[model samples]
Target: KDIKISVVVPTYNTELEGLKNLMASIDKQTMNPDEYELVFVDDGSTTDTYERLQEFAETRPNMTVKQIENSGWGSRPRNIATKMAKGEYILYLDHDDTVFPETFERVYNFGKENNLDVVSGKEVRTNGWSWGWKQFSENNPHAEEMGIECLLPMTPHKFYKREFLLENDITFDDGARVLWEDVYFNSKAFIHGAKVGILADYPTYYWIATGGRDPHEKWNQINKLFNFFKDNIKEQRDLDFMLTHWYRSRVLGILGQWLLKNNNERIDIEFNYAKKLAEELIPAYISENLDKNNQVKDYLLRQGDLDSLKKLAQIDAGITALSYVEDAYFKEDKLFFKTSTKMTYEDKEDFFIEKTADRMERILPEEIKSKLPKEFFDYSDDLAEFTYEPSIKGRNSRATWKIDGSTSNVEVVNKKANLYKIEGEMSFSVQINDYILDAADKKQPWDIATRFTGLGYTSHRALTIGKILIKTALINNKTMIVYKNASGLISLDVGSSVRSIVEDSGVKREQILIDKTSGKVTIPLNEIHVFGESLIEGNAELKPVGISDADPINVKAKLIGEANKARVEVLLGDEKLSGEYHLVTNIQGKKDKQQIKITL
Candidate 1:
């Protein structure tokens, strides 16, 4: 009857409402009071915060409050609490955030049953935006396998078994305030081969981003970021994994933001220094693994081409409409897309002119005369060309391929022909592998390309060219089933002699359709009765045709569908559900539906 879990929270200068909300959420947990304990570490908060915590601890027998000198980040307090916890399992929670009522009970039961060392659940950002944790749900293989890139959320919203941490001696780094400390800790946990699982279906954590948090405020420590990689990554495979999946995109995003924010200031020194560190730290095998999306930035970094980056920064900062998908289609597993795009340096000349003026204003007249180019003063007749190669990116599966077709000519459009238009048709194959087909069918976006060409220079820029609808069909045992259709409709083959669909949770009879073809069932997603969110609480019983009293075939269903398409997370009680589900739909007046199916 000892505590099954310990909820650890490290609080700083948290607001009164936030603290109360956190406590209230714990108080409302579905688990029995004796089953869990709350450990609150007060990281040098004001006297009032400490006093309130003490008062709360006095009232709750399952609560403990510990005070420590200020530790700028959560690491020190979290480590301390972990060592102090008596529960079999440990959960980390933020002071300002709260959990769902069933969070502890659900995750604890799952961990105990599976003997999992580390478990993660879905989290929803409650502050007018939805981001983080949810992306790497249990549905993804990476989450189940503890893939480093998939574990990128790095928030402490995860459950770790107490003995697992103690045996491995895993603890967060409490060095100079560092970014990605959670990432570092989690990466180590994963590296040590902890049994990791994700409970994606259950959204337990509610993250409230009350801006100005400690991690967000400390952005200047770029070196700490580099050191994090050096300390954690040891093996070549590990380094390769980090660079291929984590670093290139991460570093480019951070550097791009920095460059744009400090455009006027000379950041060439810091930029070059970081580039130098990467050249030394990153291995050639890992660097070579960087994909096309990141290759241009990697090249710029390696070459120390800061001037081009500066111009690229300006072009990035000054953005307008550049591209649109004129039409798109899916035929025989191939994607046919027509794109219309425009690029120009005409609108960005003012940005360059301003930068030039700012430079002249900072230096002496003689220095400006010696350093500045004549083009800086007379920029009106600058010859510019816009060039780009279009491509598609599968958001859910992270698959990318260039549009396989001829390149259209770059035509100049503005005075001095600096503005240009390039429009063309592109065709490519969509790799509908198991992973791609298993994801919730959502409109996958294409990261189309656009670039600025100037005086013998090219700066590649990305333009989002909308989304394309993909439908998948699964073939099983020589039976072809289409899972989705063009008009966003779904059909199911429940097998021969299937009469009606009856769920333990009682779905309406009208929502179920029996086809003339034996063993087939169709849920017209476009129909109003079948279009909303529905959950079959336990098992669904398939009533065999003409056998009213026949033993029912037990099935479990978790479906989220709409008028155009539906996703059926079907679990068979004993056997695997097989055969083709057609992906053919003809609902001309409505938008397409994203649909996918899974068998377990």
Candidate 2:
């Protein structure tokens, strides 16, 4: 029998729930069990992980389990499994992560249909920060055209054609202290021109984000990993590849994380080390592609200026505040907004000392100067400008402001230099209909964001003050109607005539109380009276009509009242709704069965 795909997983003291979930998800796959195989490589797990895997494999014909001495990292086990895989394609998955039911089948069919050498689908994190993996799903006509930067996620979730891997001699770098081994493996494949396929729509992989340790904890191993990449770059000796893979993964990927977690204690030592690494390993050509964020760091490294870099780092860590919109109103066709903005330093004294003198006047290299922030060399005070625009967040409709200008200013009370504030008013055409349409179309809350920019020495900086919820609206034709007013308070209109709303499962209305704060209204189905004998020919309206702007929503309801039977139909313009209802009779002391049917 021909095996279509082989899933390779490396495990070490895996969480029982996570492991079980991974297997359960695979078990629920739409593909036939016989068409694929599972290879579990246990990296000397002290727990009963291997024992469980072994037992599980015994019951599945296509499952295989292997145990190896602890190798510190997953690379060795994954490398071992690659050699043992017999299927036409190999898929790498982490023991803790689970795939969607259609993951394997969809990816497998996509790869086979396109004769792809490497195929990657979207991955979503179940915890921690989200990086918007959905955007990477551009079906590139030429796989090689998908630049290395676009494939920055070096996780082992992608599918690789088994023959392609074997023919190209591709395997994960094995041994202890093998951080970013997946990066090396993926870079090697793509650099060799692997035919890549990207699936962006359906998220195939679920990344369980366990809280990661600070960079300080893993500094030694990380240094070794960078050294490994340095050696690989020296051997490959490809300028373009060095810039594409080495520079990005090392500078941005590794060092960038370190900078974010940098505490001012050992600034000089780490800065020197970073400078040494760049000077020794990275080619000068790589600097050409560096953006403003990285370019500043690159310049500081080249200049070997630890003091300036430390100041910059502190500024990078500073806080920005955007004042609340003091007043927002519409006059005629224009909307006006008023607000103030300020930036405060995290380590204020150190930042002021570093930038006061000729310290910031150091002439930047031509290439780096262009990328520098406008306020980097300037000593002048500037006013913050306000710009208001309509925006959408989630299902919420919003109109937000962007505050941009200079970062330097003097405070009156304390004579503080860096602390600056500016008052401003912005006006734009009122697009009320747009907000209304968005609110109705999405049937969700509307919100606005006040963003601040240019708060520090760095050129590119913007922080959201906070999200202000403007309005929210949701309509349930059966039970409740909820709408948020401009003041962000919910007002519910339970039709006065309808007693209650219920489901078809004979479940009665549970709550008749309205939430005063949220403006939520609930009506029981039994309370709704069916007026017309034939619901198809007549119209129905909720009683006590003024819950919403009747002209806008135009909600209608119809009922077929009978002594022994009844039916009710509700309509919201073109949309119609019906449900099974049982009405209680007062005079007859009997329950009348009701059957509801709606026509569009």
Score each candidate by Cα lDDT. 0.53, 0.51
TM-score, candidate 1, is 0.53
Q: Estimate each model's TM-score.
A: 0.53, 0.58
Off by over 4 Å in 1: 71-75, 127-146, 212-221, 228-231, 254-258, 316-600
On the 0 to 100 scale, the lDDT of residue 68 in model 1 is: 90
For model 2 the local lDDT of residue 158 reads 82
